[PDB]
């Protein structure tokens, strides 16, 4: 056949580029970073009405000051979350302090290129790259509120706002215009909820969409369905206003 | 059918290994390098293509020393040559550690020979993309060797490989005929400079830098040393005079 860590004539890794195609078929995930906190929102996308929606866990806690949302082959994420949670707690054990959001992200991305059939470097025993992209949102005392996009390429970008999944290119163009440096946390909540409603195939309600935030004070919290339901009601009223 | 040239260790119906013969093309593509065996030592010289004025003169050294008595120069893929000398150095250290005496040149030759030959036994490795000219002084006289990607090597009076190997070999053949009593170390350095300048005409588009080294029993106490300053200029001038 052809090697799993083979270069294309255009100087790209085939398996990484095919991995990015899998992520485009995934459920939409949106992150917005403000000076009041970072908001993470995801499309649940239940395949059947019999599927108990609240069992869909696409936003997960890494530590009290770091959360992350996933998009693509969500099963692949489990071992990435496990490494991230271990890296964060392990760092706290060694240095009696919270891990830097950037350093946590860099640790998760170190896994990404550990694939091959015996590549001459170390011992990368993993048959393929990850089929999932992560939006890692957190706070630290050094660089404040941060949002990171972690790809299976092993590169990570810091975004003021970022959308990944099926409706990404559409949502990203919307975030381009709507984001300013002086957004409030509430403004960012409605904005994620608005852009999700736009790209979601289903009508957005408190069952097929989930919000979460990370603030310096209360840390990373997943919004319960009652709290999200009122923010949806608040959105519709402000859209119908003009 | 075909496909006999897609895997390293595969024999073609005519009993050839095409992957080895393709490695030879990488060598032929490379810079020209020579070796001259004089009456009590050996002289190594190589062409250094100056890509631009940005290359720091006299800095990007190509000729490598093994132990303190062996010189190695190669043509083709420079990294592959470095990998072979790295092995050669480990190989020479291993020998000296057990037997005390510094490795004889024939002994060292077979050590490189067996290692290069090993990279033609399996499809999981690529053959070496370099022909290496090496040698020095040991217990019983001076020795000059040339090692092909196949693992094939012989002893030589003179050796040449790379871009302008024909020009070189032709000039070497003239020296062997016109000096049956043997060339001197001093003379062999001047003569090496000329042959590089003459063999450069197969690459005359790009300006080049000359690099010579030698291992003489009388002139360097049987240690590998680089030709520098006055003796280098004297050799460059001898070549620049006889190119016209």
């Amino acid at each position: 056949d052809r090697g799993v860590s083979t270069f294309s004539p255009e100087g790209r890794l085939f398996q990484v580029e095919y991995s990015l195609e899998a992520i485009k078929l995934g459920s939409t995930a949106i992150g917005i970073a403000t000076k009041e906190g970072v908001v993470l929102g995801v499309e649940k996308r239940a395949t059947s009405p019999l599927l108990e929606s609240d069992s869909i866990e696409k936003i997960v806690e890494i530590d009290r000051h770091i959360g992350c949302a996933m998009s693509g082959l969500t099963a692949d994420a489990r071992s990435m979350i496990e490494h991230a949670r271990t890296a964060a707690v392990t760092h706290n054990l060694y240095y009696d302090e919270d891990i830097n959001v950037e350093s946590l992200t860099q640790s998760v991305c170190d896994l990404a290129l550990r694939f091959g059939e015996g590549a001459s470097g170390e011992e990368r025993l993993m048959s393929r790259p990850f089929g999932v992209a992560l939006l890692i949102a957190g706070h630290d005392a050094d660089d404040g509120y941060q949002l990171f996009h972690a790809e299976p390429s092993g590169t990570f970008y810091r975004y003021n706002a970022k959308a990944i999944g099926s409706g990404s290119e559409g949502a990203q163009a919307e975030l381009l215009n709507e984001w300013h440096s002086s957004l409030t946390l509430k403004e960012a909540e409605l904005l994620v909820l608005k852009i999700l409603k736009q790209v979601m195939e289903e009508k957005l309600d408190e069952n097929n969409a989930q919000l979460s935030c990370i603030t310096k004070q209360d840390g990373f919290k997943i919004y319960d369905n009652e709290k999200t339901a009122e923010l949806i009601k608040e959105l519709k009223e402000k859209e119908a206003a003009e | 059918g075909t496909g006999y040239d897609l895997s390293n260790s595969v024999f073609s119906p005519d009993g050839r290994n095409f992957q080895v013969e393709y490695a030879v093309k990488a060598v032929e593509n490379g810079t020209t390098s020579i070796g001259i065996k004089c009456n009590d030592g050996v002289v190594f010289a190589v062409e250094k293509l100056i890509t631009s004025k940005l290359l720091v003169p006299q800095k990007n050294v190509k000729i490598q020393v093994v132990d303190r008595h062996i010189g190695c120069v190669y043509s083709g893929l420079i990294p592959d040559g470095r990998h072979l000398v790295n092995r050669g150095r480990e190989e020479a250290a291993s020998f000296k550690k057990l037997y005390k005496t510094p490795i004889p040149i024939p002994a060292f030759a077979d050590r490189l020979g067996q290692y290069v030959q090993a990279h033609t036994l399996y499809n999981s490795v690529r053959p070496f993309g370099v022909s290496t000219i090496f040698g020095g002084v040991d217990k019983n006289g001076a020795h000059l060797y040339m090692l092909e990607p196949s693992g094939s090597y012989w002893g030589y009076k003179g050796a040449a490989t790379g871009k302008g190997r024909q020009s070189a070999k032709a000039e070497l053949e003239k020296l062997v005929d016109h000096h049956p009593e043997g060339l001197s170390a001093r003379e062999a350095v001047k003569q090496a400079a000329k042959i590089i300048y003459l063999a450069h005409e197969d690459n005359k588009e790009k300006d080049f830098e000359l690099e010579i080294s030698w291992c003489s029993l009388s002139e360097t106490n049987g240690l590998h040393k680089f030709v520098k300053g006055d003796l280098l200029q004297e050799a460059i001038d001898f070549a620049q005079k006889e190119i016209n």
């Binding site: 060694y94 240095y95 009696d96 302090e97 830097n100 950037e102 350093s103 050094d142 | -």
Partner: protein, 111 residues
């Protein structure tokens, strides 16, 4: 039978002020009843405004200080030149020392 440990003597003293701190130590290095050196520094600037001294077996002391100095260098590389807080250094040294719990560094260390 070979004894891996020795005693190079010396004494170290740390006092904390309201807005300052001192780490002092004698410069004498000894073996049994012989003086090795009258001036062999024992207290070291490790960077990030941390001073360290591992007194007891000089070899194990130098080894520990050397590994911690190296630990500070790699903290900078791995966490965007962030300053290693004194509390973070303390916890890091606990792991350096407990790493050799069953072949210990024969030193009493103060930072």
């Amino acid at each position: 039978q070979f004894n891996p440990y020795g005693d190079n003597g010396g004494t170290i003293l740390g006092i904390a002020g309201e807005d300052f701190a001192v780490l002092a130590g004698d410069t004498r290095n000894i073996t049994d009843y012989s003086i090795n050196s009258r001036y062999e520094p024992k207290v070291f600037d490790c960077g990030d405004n941390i001073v360290m001294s591992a007194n007891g077996f000089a070899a194990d002391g130098d080894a520990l200080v050397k590994r911690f100095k190296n630990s500070v260098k790699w903290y900078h590389f791995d966490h965007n030149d962030k300053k290693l807080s004194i509390n973070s250094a303390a916890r890091n040294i606990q792991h350096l020392l407990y790493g050799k719990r069953f072949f210990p560094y024969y030193v009493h260390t103060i930072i």
